[PDB]
Amino acid sequence: MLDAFSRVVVNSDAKAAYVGGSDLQALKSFIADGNKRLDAVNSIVSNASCMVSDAVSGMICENPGLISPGGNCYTNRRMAACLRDGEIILRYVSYALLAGDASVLEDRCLNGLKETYIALGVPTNSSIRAVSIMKAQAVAFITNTATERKMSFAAGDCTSLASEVASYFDRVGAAIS
Amino acid sequence: MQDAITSVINAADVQGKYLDANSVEKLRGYFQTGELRVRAAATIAANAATIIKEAVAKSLLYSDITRPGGNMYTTRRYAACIRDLDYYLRYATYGMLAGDPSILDERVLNGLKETYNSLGVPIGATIQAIQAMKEVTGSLVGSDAGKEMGLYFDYICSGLS
Amino acid sequence: MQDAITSVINAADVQGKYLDANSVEKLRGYFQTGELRVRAAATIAANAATIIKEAVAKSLLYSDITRPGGNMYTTRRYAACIRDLDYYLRYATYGMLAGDPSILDERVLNGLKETYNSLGVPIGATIQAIQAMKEVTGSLVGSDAGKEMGLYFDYICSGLS
Amino acid sequence: MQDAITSVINAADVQGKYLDANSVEKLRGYFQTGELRVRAAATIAANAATIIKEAVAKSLLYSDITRPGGNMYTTRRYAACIRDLDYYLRYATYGMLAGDPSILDERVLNGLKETYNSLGVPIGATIQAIQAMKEVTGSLVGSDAGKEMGLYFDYICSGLS
Amino acid sequence: HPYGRGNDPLLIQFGAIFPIGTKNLKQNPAPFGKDTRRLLIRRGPGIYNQVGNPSTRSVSVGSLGPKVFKSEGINSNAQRTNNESILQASYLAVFGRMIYQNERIGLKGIDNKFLDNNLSVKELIRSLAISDTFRSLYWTPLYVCKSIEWIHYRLLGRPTYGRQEINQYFNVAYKKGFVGVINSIIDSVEYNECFGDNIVPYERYLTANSVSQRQLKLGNIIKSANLKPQNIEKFVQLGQSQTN
Amino acid sequence: MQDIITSVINQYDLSGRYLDIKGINQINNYFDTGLKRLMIAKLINKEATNLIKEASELLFIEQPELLRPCGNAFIGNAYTTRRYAACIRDIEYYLRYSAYSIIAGNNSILDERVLDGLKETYNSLLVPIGPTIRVIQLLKEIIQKKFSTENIENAIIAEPFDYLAINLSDKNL
Amino acid sequence: SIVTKSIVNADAEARYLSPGELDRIKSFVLSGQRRLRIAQTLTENRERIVKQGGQQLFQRRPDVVSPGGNAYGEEMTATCLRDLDYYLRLVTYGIIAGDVTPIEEIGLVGVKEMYSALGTPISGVAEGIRCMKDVACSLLSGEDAAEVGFYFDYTLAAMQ
Amino acid sequence: SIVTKSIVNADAEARYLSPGELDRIKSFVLSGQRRLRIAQTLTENRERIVKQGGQQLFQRRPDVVSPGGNAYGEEMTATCLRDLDYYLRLVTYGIIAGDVTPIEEIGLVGVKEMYSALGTPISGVAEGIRCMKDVACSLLSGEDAAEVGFYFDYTLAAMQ
Amino acid sequence: SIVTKSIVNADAEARYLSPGELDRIKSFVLSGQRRLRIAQTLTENRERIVKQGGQQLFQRRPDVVSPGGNAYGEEMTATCLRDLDYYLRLVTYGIIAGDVTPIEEIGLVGVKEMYSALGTPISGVAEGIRCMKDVACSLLSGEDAAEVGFYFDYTLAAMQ
Numbered sequence A: 001m002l003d004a005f006s007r008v009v010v011n012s013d014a015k016a017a018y019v020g021g022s023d024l025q026a027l028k029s030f031i032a033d034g035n036k037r038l039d040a041v042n043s044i045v046s047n048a049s050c051m052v053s054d055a056v057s058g059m060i061c062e063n064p065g066l067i068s069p070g071g072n073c074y075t076n077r078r079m080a081a082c083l084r085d086g087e088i089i090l091r092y093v094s095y096a097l098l099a100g101d102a103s104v105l106e107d108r109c110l111n112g113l114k115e116t117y118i119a120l121g122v123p124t125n126s127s128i129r130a131v132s133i134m135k136a137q138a139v140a141f142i143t144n145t146a147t148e149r150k151m152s153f154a155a156g157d158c159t160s161l162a163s164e165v166a167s168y169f170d171r172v173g174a175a176i177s
Numbered sequence B, C, D: 001m002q003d004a005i006t007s008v009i010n011a012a013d014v015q016g017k018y019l020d021a022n023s024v025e026k027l028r029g030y031f032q033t034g035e036l037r038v039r040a041a042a043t044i045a046a047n048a049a050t051i052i053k054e055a056v057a058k059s060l061l062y063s064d065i066t067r068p069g070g071n072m073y074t075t076r077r078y079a080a081c082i083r084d085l086d087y088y089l090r091y092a093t094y095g096m097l098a099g100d101p102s103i104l105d106e107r108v109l110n111g112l113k114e115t116y117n118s119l120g121v122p123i124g125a126t127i128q129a130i131q132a133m134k135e136v137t138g139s140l141v142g143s144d145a146g147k148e149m150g151l152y153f154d155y156i157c158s159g160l161s
Numbered sequence E: 001h002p003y004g005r006g007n008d009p010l011l012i013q014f015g016a017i018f019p020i021g022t023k024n025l026k027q028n029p030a031p032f033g034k035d036t037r038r039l040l041i042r043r044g045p046g047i048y049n050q051v052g053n054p055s056t057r058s059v060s061v062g063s064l065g066p067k068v069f070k071s072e073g074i075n076s077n078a079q080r081t082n083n084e085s086i087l088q089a090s091y092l093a094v095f096g097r098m099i100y101q102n103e104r105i106g107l108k109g110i111d112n113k114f115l116d117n118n119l120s121v122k123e124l125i126r127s128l129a130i131s132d133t134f135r136s137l138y139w140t141p142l143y144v145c146k147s148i149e150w151i152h153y154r155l156l157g158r159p160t161y162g163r164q165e166i167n168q169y170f171n172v173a174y175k176k177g178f179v180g181v182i183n184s185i186i187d188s189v190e191y192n193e194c195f196g197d198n199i200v201p202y203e204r205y206l207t208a209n210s211v212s213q214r215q216l217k218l219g220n221i222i223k224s225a226n227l228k229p230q231n232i233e234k235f236v237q238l239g240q241s242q243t244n
Numbered sequence F: 001m002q003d004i005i006t007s008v009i010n011q012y013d014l015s016g017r018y019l020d021i022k023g024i025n026q027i028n029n030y031f032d033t034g035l036k037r038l039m040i041a042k043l044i045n046k047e048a049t050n051l052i053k054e055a056s057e058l059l060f061i062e063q064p065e066l067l068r069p070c071g072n073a074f075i076g077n078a079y080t081t082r083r084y085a086a087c088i089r090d091i092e093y094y095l096r097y098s099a100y101s102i103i104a105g106n107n108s109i110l111d112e113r114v115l116d117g118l119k120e121t122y123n124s125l126l127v128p129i130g131p132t133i134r135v136i137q138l139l140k141e142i143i144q145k146k147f148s149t150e151n152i153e154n155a156i157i158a159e160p161f162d163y164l165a166i167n168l169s170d171k172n173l
Numbered sequence G, H, I: 001s002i003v004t005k006s007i008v009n010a011d012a013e014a015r016y017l018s019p020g021e022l023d024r025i026k027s028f029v030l031s032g033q034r035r036l037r038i039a040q041t042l043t044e045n046r047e048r049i050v051k052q053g054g055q056q057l058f059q060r061r062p063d064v065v066s067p068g069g070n071a072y073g074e075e076m077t078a079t080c081l082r083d084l085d086y087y088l089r090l091v092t093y094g095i096i097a098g099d100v101t102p103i104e105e106i107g108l109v110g111v112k113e114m115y116s117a118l119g120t121p122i123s124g125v126a127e128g129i130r131c132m133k134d135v136a137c138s139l140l141s142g143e144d145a146a147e148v149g150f151y152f153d154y155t156l157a158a159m160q
């Protein structure tokens, strides 16, 4: 795994050079904007349990055939596996948001997830939608858009970190598609 | 002070012009309403004390400003404020007869807000008393003369606010 | 702001003088009452909310100003006025600790009458609420501290009237 | 700012009253004319530049105020005055949609005469340009909407005079 | 104002109007001590006044104050859809109006970089305020302490409190100049607690003359309807019959 | 102006209430010192010329620059006979008005007839304000040397001069 | 009012009302008639609403009327019912305005400060408002009750 | 009174007051001024003290005001608050006397017999006195509250 | 003054003085007597303090009184001793106030600007103040000298 600091190095070491001012002010701001990122991730850990229930029940609320007899989220054993998988995906997206890089999301989570689904018979269409509801919840929690719960913070703009998690979520979506 | 006629003559004279059709338009307009203006001024001169009494009774007579701590608590202050209201009514009548509020600017509004602020006189209560006086005056003189008088009453209230 | 010590030092310094026997007299006078002042300030800090509640209940709680049309009718206005009373109590406590009302002149009374007049806040009711607060405060702190606090309460009321 | 609905609700709320038959009368009156108001506002938004151009052409375009030594002689001053006329038209449209001139008091007329007097802007020429704009606007929107718009145009002219 | 009465500007949309002066002769000096604080009136509910609730910075007034413009970017993909429009709002915060076209071509470099999501709102407000257009309008034509009072009102939504706050900024102009004053205001703690890097500055506090001017007006002060509660006559109730 | 009785009565009229025991105690406080206040007034009227001569001498002994040329700074000090006479006249002014204030038990006569506008006049004439207060408290000490052990008369004398000194001063602190 | 709020939000940006805001004003003036009807029904059934809400409150919160409670005694109970009537009137105002501006500007800004200064538990007021909400929604149709409880819910949220 | 008790205790032994007793009388007359101040504060805040003590009692002992309890009804509750006022007055007397002689000679000797004859539970009176003690000590300073609760504690001990 | 500074720091937060601030005011008014005694001793030994400090300064910094130095000549040396007397007086003010507010508001704010405009080396003034500090602390006890040099050290730090 890598983070945001390591990815410029994997590049700086490939050019057999040091780390001057050129490729640093981007990293200089990252460290300076470290407070907003820690303010950002905490809002997802605070509401992680409600996010999967609002996501997976909304998946069935838009698709009642998953619980028709024979469906993927039909029985009591399969519902637990799907509610487990949703929270695993949310956990890795929170890892990638805290890291500032999607390296930990690729190899430990998305590398071998497509093959496991196709072989299991998990409907990608319904699985792909399950991530986008969580994306809509995350961008509301990061920019304090949650209409049911509000949190306390210092005022300002947080789209940067919010856009970083929106790009992570459909990166998850593109790998399992 | 300049009335409607003086203002028209000044606008024409400040350009070296003779009184053309627009000046005649304004002059005829003033001459047609002059008789109504005289009627209203006479009626207002007739009932000034009752107008002030009724406006004070409907606006600030039983409020807290007349109680201890209020501006017009003592007898000096009560008399001073009723004299002020008499001033406002008389000058509004002058302005209505003249058809021009310049007398209000020269003789009333010049340095009035500053005097009231130095004395501590509440401006909002004064504006409300003038508004109540506008009601009674329009009531007594009828609709057209009441609109004419209310023009200058609102002029005083805007200059005071 | 200047307390009693600052005022004595200023009076001595503005003449190029050393602190002579009269300055020592005033300084001893302040130093003897300082401990009573600290006791009173602590007790007042303890019971500020109850003092304001009881003063409001005895002065203007059931009058017509709290009904529709009154100043403090809506919840915004009620909260604003209780905040004002809290300001008055806190600054009177500061003045009592300092032994000098200059903080009241600099931080409270400067432009207060004009603000209240522009807003339409009744001054008499405010002075009466401050007088009721003076009763409760003297009650709670005892006779000597109550006279000390009432000095600055009356100072605020005189600066407001 | 408060529109007709806000004003009715405020008049009812300041007395602890529920909305009775007279409030319903005023509310129905506003609701019946709302659609005409929206039509007029759309049409005025469509043709603001042409309205200002035609008013300026008929009121002060060839007078002496535009010659070397005039108020609006240089290009800075010409642009500034056409921007002022755009302000007046936009705020009159807001007032017509709201059915209440309080926005004109809060956002336009507050301290406007004093600014114009400090700058040296002629008030009479401004009032005449606003009157010419009233003609074109009533012309473009028809009789009823023109009377509605002329109400607030005359309100601005009275607040400026 | 702690200085003469002529040091108070008119609080209008776009201003720089000081009516007291050579032509008016309505001038009132008054002895104001060094320690002194002006009673400001909050643009909104009283109780969010910040003098007895210093914690109420960052907290919305609601419908009783001016509108607040924020570049939130909260869409399910976190896109900003008001870049065109937060930029228009900043021009009014800094200038009060839209500057002329020939004036604005010197500021296109600043505007293009903001519309590409490369500037915060705070850095945009800084770039407009330190420009040659703002300086030629509000620094050079004005008395040095009248200019500080006006600029302090545009960037922070309030006039100054007293002499301690004004000899303070006045000393920065003595040593650094026009740019030293604009930077020390924007980098203040009051700026970053009220606006952050995200919000366009809005009007926060007023004066007694400003409020007395806005309110106290016909069309704003009710024509005595709080009093005058009309009720039925008792002799009319005693002769009334059934409703329907 | 207002004496102490008038100001107490005005404080009670402001709230529209009758006099209670607190204000009556305040009035009794004045009624019990009135006679010694009159004794002080008579002493001041008996010794005015000598008191002011002593005060002026003690002022000019420690501020000798007040008697020398103004320096180019056109300062109004006691340089020539004209300025000297004017300054002694002012000293008599201060003595008279603080005698009034001692008799009234109040300082309102002071700030209405002495303090209002004083600093404007002295600034326009460039009269020294430091030595001016210095001579006032010199006068206070000279008067207090007549009644020393009677402490109540000491405070009664200290009131007006100390009010004048604290109000003519600038607030360095 | 919806018109007022649209006008201010457009005024801050120095622009005319866009076609979306005008669309919404149009939809509001078109629904004003059923708004007035609903305000009628809630307005003229005030006695039963206040009475039955006071009952449900006093059965759910017996401490406030227990011996010594804030609303203990005839006068205090009358004052509490007076407060409930205040809030019902504000809800009717908000229903006719189309937005919670009347409710929030009158009765919500600084309500916690007032009720803390009076010694009244704010949760009791919230309970009374909820009881009045149930009683009032019982007298309306499905869609009407849904739209009317929309304001009771806001008043409850602001009064937490 | 401390002076009285010293005089009797010296009188039984047929001797003048020793220098210790005179020392203590001296210390008492020197502290009389703050004693009067504390009695002032407790005396003129009697309404809040009785009210808030009655609340804490009725919340701690709901049976006495429950249906049928000794203080059940308007009149009985008023009488119980009257008793609490009696005991607050006695505590002020004891504070100014410097000793519990006023409290004990009036209101403590034979209190169990009286309250048993009336049918009142003495533990309820003790609870009311404790609640009044907390309320009254809340309004005093540290040392003042310590010295004032000194008498409430004695009244509670005698009323077990 | 300590009381003044506590009052302002409590005023900005819109709260009464907490018990810590009142504790500290109490401790200050209790120590005021030895504060006045120390101010006495420093005040009435001013001639020796200024003289001996001027000596130690002129022996440590012969350039300032050398031919042409800032304090060169009879008048300039007298003016420098005048400045040292100014600062000793300010130190006595600060000792009685219990805090460096008098010293800092008079004589420290803008001192560098003044002495740069006059052409005087500020380090020479610092040396003079240090010499006066040693001379003055020589006349006090251990704890008194420690507390008195507490202000000379602040004046030196501000005058770097």
Ligand SMILES: C=CC1=C(C)[C@@H](Cc2[nH]c(/C=C3N=C(/C=C4\NC(=O)[C@H](C)[C@H]4CC)C(C)=C\3CCC(=O)O)c(CCC(=O)O)c2C)NC1=O
Pocket (backbone or CB within 6 Å): A056, A066, A072, A073, A077, A078, A079, A081, A082, A083, A085, A086, A088, A089, A108, A109, A113, A116, A120, A122, A123, A126, A127, A128, A130
């Ligand atoms: C490290 C990353 C990591 C993951 C992502 C998951 C991936 C994953 N999911 C399942 C297994 C499963 N996953 C699902 C899920 C679903 N069916 C649907 O239509 C919905 C889209 C979705 C719920 C939201 C179901 C229903 C099963 C069980 C299949 C069955 O028994 O019918 C399995 C097989 C193991 C098992 O049976 O539990 C694995 C490896 N596990 C991991 O370790």
Ligand SMILES: C=CC1=C(C)[C@@H](Cc2[nH]c(/C=C3N=C(/C=C4\NC(=O)[C@H](C)[C@H]4CC)C(C)=C\3CCC(=O)O)c(CCC(=O)O)c2C)NC1=O
Pocket (backbone or CB within 6 Å): A047, A050, A051, A054, A057, A058, A060, A061, A062, A132, A133, A136, A137, A140, A141, A145, A146, A147, A148, A149, E076
């Ligand atoms: C039966 C049908 C049925 C549905 C259609 C859904 C309803 C639903 N809610 C959300 C949307 C959401 N769901 C949440 C989740 C929460 N909100 C909180 O504040 C809590 C902390 C947490 C659950 C307790 C959030 C934060 C949003 C974003 C919008 C919002 O702020 O409410 C979305 C995503 C929108 C999209 O698809 O883009 C959906 C489909 N749930 C259902 O059951």
Ligand SMILES: C=CC1=C(C)[C@@H](Cc2[nH]c(/C=C3N=C(/C=C4\NC(=O)[C@H](C)[C@H]4CC)C(C)=C\3CCC(=O)O)c(CCC(=O)O)c2C)NC1=O
Pocket (backbone or CB within 6 Å): A032, A033, A035, A036, A038, A039, A040, A042, A142, A143, A144, A153, A154, A155, A156, A157, A158, A159, A161, E196
């Ligand atoms: C583990 C504990 C821990 C945290 C959670 C964060 C907590 C935190 N966040 C911020 C501070 C902040 N936090 C935000 C973030 C936001 N503001 C908003 O309006 C949005 C809701 C959200 C966007 C994601 C902003 C905009 C600031 C102030 C600007 C900044 O810090 O750069 C600050 C102030 C210090 C600073 O200025 O940097 C702190 C302590 N830091 C910690 O040590």
Ligand SMILES: CCC1=C(C)/C(=C/C2=NC(=C\c3[nH]c(/C=C4\NC(=O)[C@H](C)[C@H]4CC)c(C)c3CCC(=O)O)/C(CCC(=O)O)=C2C)NC1=O
Pocket (backbone or CB within 6 Å): D065, D071, D072, D076, D077, D078, D080, D081, D082, D084, D085, D087, D107, D108, D109, D112, D115, D119, D121, D122, D125, D126, D129, E012, E013, E014, E015
């Ligand atoms: C929203 C309400 C509102 C208004 C109306 C307003 C007006 C306003 N008009 C101004 C100037 C001006 N206004 C005019 C207007 C006119 N000249 C004429 O001859 C005509 C009669 C008239 C146009 C009809 C001119 C020429 C100036 C420029 C003055 C100058 O450059 O000296 C200025 C000075 C600001 C600047 O341009 O730098 C303000 C603030 N401000 C406001 O907030």
Ligand SMILES: CCC1=C(C)/C(=C/C2=NC(=C\c3[nH]c(/C=C4\NC(=O)[C@H](C)[C@H]4CC)c(C)c3CCC(=O)O)/C(CCC(=O)O)=C2C)NC1=O
Pocket (backbone or CB within 6 Å): C065, C071, C072, C076, C077, C078, C080, C081, C082, C084, C085, C087, C107, C108, C109, C112, C115, C119, C121, C122, C125, C126, C129, E038, E039, E040, E041, E042, E043, E044, E045, E046, E047, E048, E049, E051
């Ligand atoms: C530190 C000194 C100081 C004071 C005292 C002060 C007062 C002050 N009081 C205000 C309002 C107010 N003040 C009151 C007070 C009262 N109403 C009554 O009926 C009573 C008589 C009185 C309370 C005793 C009310 C009701 C308002 C609100 C006015 C309104 O909302 O229109 C406002 C307007 C600010 C706002 O609330 O948005 C200020 C600035 N400011 C200061 O700096």
Ligand SMILES: CCC1=C(C)/C(=C/C2=NC(=C\c3[nH]c(/C=C4\NC(=O)[C@H](C)[C@H]4CC)c(C)c3CCC(=O)O)/C(CCC(=O)O)=C2C)NC1=O
Pocket (backbone or CB within 6 Å): E034, E143, E144, E145, E163, E166, E167, E168, E170
């Ligand atoms: C660019 C034109 C301009 C000028 C001139 C100006 C003057 C100005 N002089 C000030 C103070 C002052 N000015 C002086 C000046 C003097 N004392 C004397 O005895 C001398 C006669 C005189 C010097 C020759 C002093 C002593 C103060 C400080 C007042 C105080 O601290 O109370 C202040 C108060 C600001 C502060 O220091 O905090 C201003 C704004 N401002 C301007 O914008």
Ligand SMILES: CCC1=C(C)/C(=C/C2=NC(=C\c3[nH]c(/C=C4\NC(=O)[C@H](C)[C@H]4CC)c(C)c3CCC(=O)O)/C(CCC(=O)O)=C2C)NC1=O
Pocket (backbone or CB within 6 Å): F067, F079, F080, F081, F082, F084
């Ligand atoms: C140029 C016109 C002019 C003169 C002359 C003048 C004199 C003058 N002489 C004074 C005092 C004095 N003058 C003298 C002495 C004398 N004086 C003499 O002309 C004699 C030579 C001598 C007596 C033999 C003494 C001893 C004092 C001290 C005052 C005292 O304590 O009585 C004083 C009071 C202040 C001071 O002590 O310096 C003035 C103002 N003022 C003027 O404007």
Ligand SMILES: CCC1=C(C)/C(=C/C2=NC(=C\c3[nH]c(/C=C4\NC(=O)[C@H](C)[C@H]4CC)c(C)c3CCC(=O)O)/C(CCC(=O)O)=C2C)NC1=O
Pocket (backbone or CB within 6 Å): C061, C062, C066, C067, C073, C074, C075, C078, G064, G065, G069, G070, G071, G072, G076, G077, G079, G080, G081, G082, G083, G084, G086, G087, G106, G107, G118, G120, G121, G122, G123, G124, G125, G128
């Ligand atoms: C329009 C918005 C608005 C509100 C809400 C308002 C409330 C308000 N409630 C009051 C009292 C009160 N309110 C209550 C209410 C309650 N007791 C309880 O236990 C319950 C929880 C609650 C009833 C649901 C009581 C008991 C009092 C009297 C308190 C006292 O006098 O001790 C008072 C003081 C007396 C009076 O009614 O004039 C005001 C001003 N004023 C307003 O302008």
